[model samples]
Target: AKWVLKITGYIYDEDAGDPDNGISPGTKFEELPDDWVAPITGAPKSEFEKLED
Candidate 1:
């Protein structure tokens, strides 16, 4: 499962397995809900792809 952050403040999930997770697979968010954060596990900052339009 891979994820990316859009410049418009969207967090895209590539392989969301469960619908119970709330966030649908292939959906985007302007801002994550309270207490929810997406930190890449064991990955470096450079692993994040920058959004440039």
Candidate 2:
């Protein structure tokens, strides 16, 4: 069996403007910061998901 992984969050650019206010809102990510966002065909013990700007 396989499982689907999806990420919906906000991303911001520090050089563009203020970091406090996100530049892009409601963004999707395949792989953000570290971890991976896709699918697992095997029965994994655990998984980690990270979202960063």
Candidate 3:
């Protein structure tokens, strides 16, 4: 299983699956573990990362 930080906001603020990939309230961000890091690693294989750098 993958660990992550769920993001949320005015945009699609419902239970969007995994946190790291989803959206959640920023105010609650601190409530999450302090050691939170990117759930996905290794050069970001997704197209979004490649589109820029």
Candidate 4:
């Protein structure tokens, strides 16, 4: 899943996950930590919207 930061418009790609933020490539949206925040805006994972492939 590719999650989009609604406010900041930052795109969080599950397949190209952010290793620095604990998200490895191929990581699922549901697998993200509860406290996970967008690297660009610090927005919580809940605030991100899933994108279609």
Q: Candidate 3 or 4, higher TM-score?
A: 4
**Candidate 1 backbone overlaps, count:** 0
RMSD of 1: 8.0
In candidate 2, stretches whose alpha carbon ends up further than 4 angstroms from where it belongs are 1-7, 18-53
Candidate 1 clashing pairs, residues 3+ apart or interchain: none
Q: Clashes in model 4: which pairs?
A: none
Candidate 4 per-residue C-alpha lDDT over 1-53 given as tens digits, one digit per residue, 9 for 90 to 100: 67877787777778888766776678776677776675556467677788864
- The per-candidate count of clashes, in order, stands at 0, 0, 5, 0
Q: Which wins on TM-score, candidate 2 or candidate 4? A: 4
Q: Candidate 4: how many backbone clashes?
A: 0
Instruction: State model 2's lDDT.
Output: 0.29
By descending lDDT, how would the candidates be arranged?
4, 1, 2, 3
Q: Where does candidate 3 stray beyond 4 Å?
A: 1-27, 39-53
Candidate with maximal lDDT:
4
Give candidate 2's error at residue 47 in angstroms.
18
lDDT of 1 by residue, 1-53 (tens): 34444432433453452244465565433333443444443133233443434
Query: What lDDT does model 4 reach?
Result: 0.72
Writing each residue's lDDT as its tens digit, candidate 2 over 10-51 gives: 222223422243323333332123332223432221342333
Of the two candidates 3 and 4, the one with more favorable lDDT, higher being better, is: 4
